[PDB]
Each structure stands twice: as C-alpha cells, then as structure tokens.
Point group: D4
Chain length 204, copies 8
C-alpha cells in the first residue's frame, strides 16, 4: 500500500498530471457546519494515495484547491453529496466536474438496495475494504497507520469502479441521465449547505 | 368567451404563441403516466387567456404544441413540472426544455411554510382564487363541461405572474443560480420517473 | 311508500325478481362475521325500488333470497362485495355467485382518485346524494326506524346504474377481462376471510 | 447436478413430454418494465434443469412459449406473481394454468410467516439451497458455473414441493380455494404490469 | 337549582344516597394520578340530580363519599372507570367496588363502532347532548363557574340510564358474564396503573 | 427424560393425584378457529410428562377434561391466554383455576422485556430448553422423538417456575394483583374466541 | 395609533423601557436560523403597547434593543423562547438573559392539556383572542401591512399578563424552582440548536 | 479488582477524601417509583470500588448522603439522569454538582450514535467491560462475585473517561455548554420523578 502522508496540503501536483482524481474525506461527523474537515484522501488512480491531515481552523489548501477547480479534471467520489459540501465549506471552492460511484451504482445495480463502497468493491472488483466506521476521532493530533490505510482504501479503487460503472451505464442505456445527475450534484451539495439537507427539492 | 379557447387535438396555429415563455399544465386519468393517458393540455401565452386542448385516446402527435415544447428559445413554465414533463414526453416523444417550475421556486423562496400548492401560491402571491387539484373528474370523458374548461384554464392563467414574483424573490434571497440548476435537471428527473425511479430520490445516501 | 318494501325474514315471493341482476347489501352488528350477526338484507331489482328484510337473531334460512343467491343466471351486484359475500355465506350457507363489485370496478376505472366509497361514486357518476356508511345504528334493534329503512334502501337503489357506467368505463379503458377475473375470484376471497385470512393479502410476496 | 445450458430458447421439446414444468427467472431487478429478463430456468421434474440465457432485446422464444401456452401443462412456480409478469412482458404470452408453491405454503404452513423457497425446501424435503441473493448482475455476457447451479436449484425441487403441498391442502381442506388463487394469479400479474403492482385490488 | 348541588370537601350526609347504585366521575389536574391531584368528585343517585364536590389541595379524607365507595352493596357506575378508580384510591385510600363501567359495556355491545366516548353514547343511546371531555379547565381553580358545575354534573346525570340500556344489550348479545368478569378485574387494572404498569397491557403476549 | 406418549387422551388419572398440573399445547398456528389442536402436553410436576396426540376432528378427551374442570387443581401455563382458548375451543371446558408464569414474570422481572419460557427457565432455574419454533407441522401423522422431547420440555419446569415466581410476588408485594389477573385470564381467553383477540378491552 | 409604534432597525431610545421585564417575539423567513434571516423584532414593556421593528437584510447591529437583551436586571419574556433566543443571538451576537418562557411555564402548570400554543393560552388564561402562528407572510417584504403590524404586536401585548398568571400557578402547584432552572438552561438549549443539535434532545438516554 | 463490599452504607469516608466520586446504581428496573434501589456502587477514582447492598425499605445512608450533599465533590455518572432520580427518591437528597459522561460523549463524539458505557470505555481507554444486562434480579438476598465485579466495573473508569471528555470538550469549544447541561441535569431528574419522565420539557 503506497501511501504518502501530508500536513495541510499536497506539496505539489507532480503526481496529479491526470484527467481524473479520486477523493474522499474524514470529518468529525455528518453535519458540515458543526463537524470540521479532518482528512482529505486523494488518489491519481495509479494504485497510490495521498492522505492529508487538515488542521483545526485551516482555511486554505492551494494545491488541492487547484485540482478541485480544474474543469479538465473529473473529481470521482463515492460519498459525493457529502464530500462536495465538506470541501466547499472548508476551502470555498465547489469541485466540478464530478462522477459519483454511488449514483452510478443506483442507476446500474438495479437488483439490490446495497450501494455502499465495501459492497461495490467486492462485487465489481473482488476487492475487500472496511465499511465506514464510527470508532475514529479523526480530529486526533496523531493518526495511526491503521487510520491512514483505512483512509487510503476509500480512494484507491474509485477509478476502477468508475470504469466498470461506465460500461454498465452504456450497456443499460443510462449514460446521459447519469451525466445530468453528476452535473446537478454540486448544486445538491450547495442546497445542503444552504439549509435543505433534509429535503428532496424535487418532491411533490 | 375570449378568455378560454377550446380545441381538439392540437393548437390550430401558433399566432398566439410568438412569445418567450408559455405556461403549461395537463389533465390525465391519474398519476401513473404508463397507465393513465394524457387527456387535456392547457396552455397560456401569459396574456390572461388560455387554450384548452382535448387529447384523444391513442393520440401520438400534436405538431404545433410540440414545436413549442422543442423550441429552446421558449421557456416552458409549470407548477406541476416533474409530473407534466413526464406526461408530455410519454405522449408525444419530446422532453420539453428549457423549463421554470413555480413549485421548486416556491420551495426555494417561501421558506416559512410547507404549503407549496398552486391554490396557496395564487392566493398568497397574487390574491387570486382558484380551486385546489380535484379528484372528481374523469378527464377522458367524451364531453368536457364549461366548469372543467374553467378549472383547466385556471391552472395556466397565472403561472407567468407567479414566475415574475418568484424570480424577484430568488434574486432577493440569493438563490437564482441554484434554482436554475434545479430547472436544468428537472427534465432528467422526469425521465428517471418514466424509466422506473418514480419512487426513489436518486440523491439519497 | 312504493319505493321501499319492508319484510320480516325473507322476500315473500320472487314476483319482483324475474331479472338478470340484483343489487344487494347488508347491515350487521359490525365487521367481524363470526361475532357480529346479520341484521338486514337489502335488495333491489334495479327498477328504483328496494326490499329491506329484517333478519332475526339465530336465523339460518331465507329460502327465497337464497334462490336468488344460488341462481347462476342472476348476477349479484354489490359495492361492499368482499364483506357482504362473507356475511351472506355465513348466515345461510350459500356463497353467492356470479357477482359484480362496483368498488373493484371503481378501482379499475377511477384511476385519478383514492376515494372509492359508495357515497362518492353515487355523487360523481350519477349526481345522486346518499349518506356515507355510518357507525350510529344498532341494526339488531327490535324496531328499525323509517330513516334506517331509507338508509338501507339507498345502498342498493343505485347499484345497477353504477354498474352500467362502470362497465362502459372498463370497456373504454381496456380492463373488462381483468375485472371479470376479479369478480370470479371474489367469492374465494370472502371464503378465505371466513377461514381465517381476513387480515392477509394472499398474493403478497 | 444435470444442467443443460442454452442460448435464447430450448432447442426442442424432447425433454418436455410432461404434464407439468417448473419455472423461475433471473432479471436485472424487481421492476419488469425497467429490468429485463436475463435467464429462464426450467425443469421437467426429473432431476434435470435447463438454464436459458436471454439476450438484451430478445423478443421471441418459440419452444419455451409453446410450453407456456400449452393448457395441458401446469406451470409450477415459487415466485409466481413475479415470474408470470416477467415472462408475459418478455414474450407476449401469459402462462397458464399455474401452481404457486408460495401461495400453497401460505395456505398450509399456518404456523409460520416464513414462506421462502429455501425454507420450504429444507422443511418439506430436507433439501438445502441458497436463498435469493442480490449479488449477481444477471445481464453479464458470461454466466458462471455457480450462477448456473444457483439458477437450476430454483427449479429442481418445485415438482416435489407441489406434491407435498397438494397433500397438505387436501388434509386441511383448502384445495378448492388454492385452485381459485391459481386461476386468478395470471390476472394478478397482468394487473401488476398494468400499473397496480403496489395495490391489493381486494382491499377495502 | 335543584338539579345540581354544590359542596365543599364531602357530601354533607347520605340522605340522597340510600340507593343500590351511584354514578361517579372526577375532575383532576390531568391524566397522571401521582402528579395531578383530585379536584372535583361528581356523583348522582340516578334520580336526575347530581352532587358536585370541590376537593381541596392535600385533602386526604372524605368520609361520607368513602362510605359509599366501600359499601359492597352499592355498585359504583363509571364511564371513565379505569382512570377514576385510580384517582379515588390514590386520594382517599379505598379502592371502590363493586363497579360497572359503561365504556367497557359499550365495547362489548356496540360492536359496529370504534367510538365509545361518553358524548357519543349519550347521544346514540339516550338522545342526550353533553360536551365531550375538554382540555380547557384548570379544575384546581379557587372558583368553579356555573358552566363548570354543569359540565361536571352532565358526566354523572346519565350513567344509570346508560347502564340500563347496556345491561339489556349485554343480555341480548350473550356477554353478561364476560362483562361482569371485566368489572371484577377493573379495580386491579387501576391498582396496576398506580403501581407502575399504566402503559402496559398485562395480558399481552 | 421420562415421557409417556398417548393417543387422544390420558388413559387414567393414576399420575394426576396432585393439586396442580402443568399444561401446554401444539397447534397448526396462532388462530384457534383456523388452526386445530394437535398435541396436549401435561406434567404432574414430578419430572415426567405426558404427550397426547390429538386427532383431526377430535371432540372429546374425558380424562384430560376432568383435570381441566377440577377446581381443586391449579392449571399452570406459560402460554396461558393462548392455551386456554385452544383447550376451550377443542373440548368445551374453559380450564380454571390457573396460574400463568408469563404474567407472573411480567409482575416480578421488572428489569427486562424478555418474558419467554426459554429465558425464564435459564434465569430462574439454570435449565436450558428450546425457544418456541416455527418449523414443525404438528398435524403430522407421526411425531418424532425430537418433537416429543420439545413438547415435554415445555411442561417439565412450570411447577418449579411457579414456586420461584410466587416467592418473588410475595417479596415485591404483588400476590393479590397476580391472583386477580389469574382469575380474569379465562375471560380474557373467552373474549379472544368471541372476536376480541386483537383488542385490549381495558384500553381507553 | 398609540397601541403600536413602528420603527426601522432599532428602538429610537429606551424611554418606554425603564422596566424590570420586557416581552419579545420575532418574525423571520422560516424556522432555520442559519438560512432564514431575522425580519421583525416585536417588543412590549407590558403597558398594553408594543414596538414593531423592521430589521433589514444583513443588519448586524441594533444597539438599543441589544442593551435590553444584555441587561441582567431585565427579564426577557417569550412564548417562543427556544427559537427567538437562537434568532436574536445569531442576528446581533448577544444571547439574551435572564428569561421567562410562557410555553415552558404552561407545560409545567397546564398539566391537563397537550395544547400549549400562544393563541390557546391567551384565550384560556386571559379571554384574549389572537391569531395562531400563520404561514402566509413573507416577513422580508419591503412593506409590512397594518394587519401584519397588528399580528406581530399581538404576540407580545399579553406576555406580561400570561407570566403573572403562570407564576401564580407555578407557586400553587409547587414547581417554581424547577421552572427557574429550565429558564436558566434555555439560553444554552438555544446555543446548542445553533451549534448543530437542533433536532436532538441532549438529555435523551 | 479491589472491591469492598458493604451492607446499607459506607462505614466511614476514609477512602473519600477526594474532589470527585464515580457513582452508579442497580435497581429492579427503569421506573424509580416502582423499582427499588438495590445497589449503590462508588469509586474514589483510585482503581478501587465500594459496592453497597441496599435493603428493601431502607430510608437512610448517612455517609453516602454526605458525599451526595457535599458541593465541593463532583459526582460523576454515566447514567446520570436515571441514577440521580433513583438516589434522590431513595434517600431524599438530589446529588450536586455532577458530571455526566454520556452527555459529554454526545457533545464530543459527534461521529457516532453509540454513547454507551461499554463503547466509550473501549474507544477512549481500550478498557473492556460488559454492556448493561437484563439478567440480574438485583434484589436477591445474596449477590454473586460476578455481580459485584459487574457493578464495580461501572464506576472504576468514570474518572478517566471524564478526564478524556474534558479535553475533547475544550478542544471542540463546548465546555461551557456541557457545564450548563450538568447544572440542569438534577432538575431534569427531578422533573422525571415529578411526572415528566417521557416528555422533553424543551420541545415545541
């Protein structure tokens, strides 16, 4: 497991001369206004990962933000709706464009209600990772090796999941609808930050 | 009279529709577009008049209406947008765009209430009285009554005026861009309903 | 008057019942056929008149009524079919057939509403006003009031007219064969209720 | 396990000179209008099974359809309400007459709320099979040996279950009511396709 | 007037209570007997008159009332039996018995309804109009209004008449013995509420 | 395990010169009007049990009924509300007087919501039995040794449970209330047969 | 008239507020203080008059009002205390204290009801008629109508009178100290709502 | 495990010359008016515990009550809302001031809904204890060694949990709000005894 650890930000973009990046975050909980960003994990898709410890009160991360702003780079998430809100709230940039493997799973894996990251890693790639846990204080001053490996596992496979899901979207005729969902997803996250996190804006 | 113009099948021409936005609603046999056929299309150019078009069973074409639905320079205004877009696309094969939905705009501006129905916003924003949506009409009946024509017309006669108020409120409260993104997605939301996700929020965790 | 004919125990003969379809309802002491006895049978031949028959406690026979229930050439029309078939079979030992149920027919045609009660369909389809089903009558009382006779009669006076409208709608919307299969199954649905499955949908996954 | 694999259709009816056949299907999910038919599995009741891979867009299966139409052949299902809708939607013929082991179980095994196929195979026959899973993309171009065996297991025991359930229906006095349920079941499936899949048509 | 007699603390004597059954209700500060004190006891001998007794804060004794509660030759009739028995036992130390509860009797006879409130049965069985139970009175107030005295009296003025009707119906429908066993258990049901099982059905599986 | 098997009825009351008997039943399910009585199991409290197979349509069991009618003999149940209804429906006699170990548990074991027979056997006596199962067709013509042992286990310990629960009722001051519950229980079962099985008659 | 005084932004001075307790309510764009801005502050000194203060978008200061909110010698009386304290602290940076909440006091005294709204207690305790809280006003509108000023004033004109009654009842029923502890905690309850626990009971098991 | 067992009360306060004590109780169940106090367990925070068996009808415990009344001694609980009500009901003194580790957990461990004592002992201290059980009659005349050890485990770690939680409250900026919750908690328990145990007094 090739994991590069950083404080605050990537040191440069030497490993990020790519057209897509895989991103996840760790926080103090599910409420972005209450629960601060603690870790950003990111992978170029080459089987390596960067795990970035974010300090309390940290307002800037310029190299990461360059990637988030770069419209030629697709930001891949599984927890897209959540992570986009957390990243926009932390550093002021709503990342775009995006691909969400959970939305893509919902639009292709029509035979199940299980769309978690552990499930799709196992089913689509035969890769074993941990489910999302509730046992870590991610604001701890020192993150353990186990925590770095957990964080890295959440981004090491997103490019490969996206490739499979793209094939299935084309096979079953839903590529254009998925793309429209991805175009809307940054707004869905903005609406969550604005005060509609518990409302489906499209409900009757 | 002059307020309501009744037609069979389609608009007769587009003389009244040389406009930048039209207001649309539909009447059907119920809430399931695959089971419940389109029965009426009601449309207004925003001038205080309305066209009420009776749609026949099995009707696959309505070329003049469809020109308006396809015309990207004309905004199609709805209150029941998610539903009506699915019904219209299923009936005639064109997903209307671009759109403005007064229900979504109400949800993003009238933050002090959970009541976003058409009767409520007509009364609150315009002091206009209309009927709530009813469950008492067989809209596939051979003969539509004058009361039914008036009910259908009332659902489109005020949408331009509501849109004007709601646009001002979206700008005042800083939500114009988010509303526009919702309107851009709405045709896909309706497509997903027709495809089999009508009971699912695609953005749920 | 001439509209309502009151009887004890049974019809006196079948002079008014030389017909191809009869309309039937019942009054009981409540919703549980094993606990709550049959108290009234109301029946109409479809000519704007009704017979209201007071049933005694412990009554096991009603031969003239039962001839009609058994006669396969006479369709028994109900609105409360699932319930009334169970009550009648439990009381007199004959499961009536064949049947037409206006509630099932309403569910298969009035696809724009969730309101399928008898008062609603009488008003909507016929412009006829009747009372909704009430919870204020001890139907086992020794004396039935004129108001009670009128209420019971109103539940059967309009079923032929409702059936005519609903048959037309089933044909219009293409569901005649499915409705007929529901009517064929309904006596078994009522038998299953009496057997102990009253709270279970036998077709559930 | 004698499994005969086929593409599209049975090649002939040489193995189907019988009075009853056992049928199940695999699909992309629970919504017949969205989720296509992917596999038809069928057994003559002799301890063998045919597993038929159905192509995307496939409109015909003439030998299978002959069996579905043949009124002298009872079609046995456990998932009857679902499979009848799927088969009618795929090929245009509503199979009849039918026997449903789940309905028969509900009418005889009055001491339990567990009416799944795995449960009744174990209880009535002491046979072990897998429960219905949510881990298979049945639209995959190549089905695995494990998938063929899973599909075959769903039809290999239905004749034997029907024989036991018929004895219990007669013992407890419910044969005629069960038969009326089987006569109505094709209509129940038609009503599902027509738009009433979430409604009990007999509710008050 | 002569219909309502108002008293402080207790009945003045038992001149009006040389009877075989009395009708009782209470008013309190709410539904929790440990928190919400007894404020009024209303009682009638069944002759169309009622005594309304204001109970003081901290009152532990009411000897004349308590003689009636203890007297096993006098049936205490309630509609709100489960509640009032707990309140009275908590206030004065005597669990009243024997009892007849018109609500339980209604549940065992009026099998055609889920409405077993006092206003409903007064109207249906006697054609008597009273108020439903209200939530607008501070019954611990220093001064009780004439309207409050009339409300309290109305809750006991009709219980003998209801009991007579309900006894006849219990006999007609064959449930007298089961009702009597319910009445025998009711004081224990009230004791169990005071002991800490107020939210539990002790007979649940 | 001393188990005496019988068809239809006890042959005599030689083992029942006692002041209390422990009783349970097996049936085709939870609805006494639909689901017939199949087994009566009974113990004198001496570590032995009688298991009585009841035939379809059986209307009499005179020796058992003598015990049910005998007012000098307490009938002990754990499933009292159910078993009393089943026995009264089968043979025409509502047993009395009774003691119910489930009611007694609810009135003493105030620290738990678990009042099943397996739980109280383990907690009060350190005895291990099976929980109530849903896998047996109790109307089968031949009951297995395992079924006889299961049925016997349900009555072998009720006298001992009653003795413990009586001590706890006296310790915590609830003997009189429990006795009133036991006096009412036959009526509660009658009301179930009469049509109130789903209603708490004491509800507001 | 003299009953309602209208102001922009703040009170003009504190001539009417040389008092030991003030009554306060607010109007906003909705229930979420982070999304829905403060639009009106209404305040009364308890003399049958009220000040209604229109708050501008983006307003961060209201120095005269804030002096009252900060003054520990002045009790701030609310009915909607938990909400209004959060709104006021979010708007101007001061958490008002000390406080008296008539809703909490009602819950601790009116133990016979689950209705603790302002309209209900005004009617029951004072025989005063006001409107319930409405969902029909855009309180951020440029122009507030006379009817809106009257509605806002009615929410503060009676709080001193309600507090007087409720204080007497708290003493009568022995709950003064517990109520005071609730009032002391209430500002923290409002802070916890703003911090992200608005949907959580912090004292739940 | 250093456990000192006592009947009725501490014999003296020789082990309690401390500024904070850790307390829990065992009872006959969750309703303080119905279910009597059976055990008080208390620790000075030095790795020892006192387990005090409380008799039926016991009205006094003067040495324990001295600690409960002493305003210079913080009473630490995990089950604070419950234990405060039980102690006040038993002996007449509402303990104050208090610290509740469950409230402190809710205000710091924002990434989880699991705030039980077993969970926080494991996560914050790597200490293993049993969860709260429902298998003990705590009114038994003789408590077992296992019961004494269970009771002691509930107080041996509360001082250490409080120290960790205080650090987290300061780190995340919630010390003052937590202190106000602790000041209100005795009133919350009084309101439970008064008749509001099922109501959130702050609800709209």
């Amino acid at each position: 497991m090739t994991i590069r650890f950083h404080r605050n930000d990537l040191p440069n973009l030497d490993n990020y001369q790519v057209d897509a990046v895989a991103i996840d975050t760790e926080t103090l909980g599910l409420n972005p206004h209450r629960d601060r960003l603690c870790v950003v994990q990111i992978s170029p898709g080459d089987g390596t990962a960067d795990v970035i410890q974010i300090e309390a009160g940290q307002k800037k991360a310029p190299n990461l933000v360059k990637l988030l702003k770069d419209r030629s780079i697709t930001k891949i998430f599984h927890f897209g709706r959540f992570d986009l809100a957390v990243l926009a709230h932390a550093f002021g940039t709503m990342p775009q464009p995006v691909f969400c493997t959970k939305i893509a799973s919902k639009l292709t894996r029509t035979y199940t209600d299980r769309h978690g990251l552990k499930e799709i890693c196992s089913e689509l790639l035969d890769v074993s990772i941990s489910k999302q846990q509730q046992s870590s204080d991610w604001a701890a001053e020192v993150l353990s090796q186990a925590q770095l490996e957990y964080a890295a596992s959440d981004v090491l496979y997103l490019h490969r999941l996206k490739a499979v899901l793209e094939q299935r979207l084309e096979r079953d005729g839903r590529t254009k609808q998925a793309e429209a969902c991805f175009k809307f997803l940054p707004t869905r996250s903005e609406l969550d930050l604005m005060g509609w996190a518990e409302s489906d804006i499209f409900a009757h």
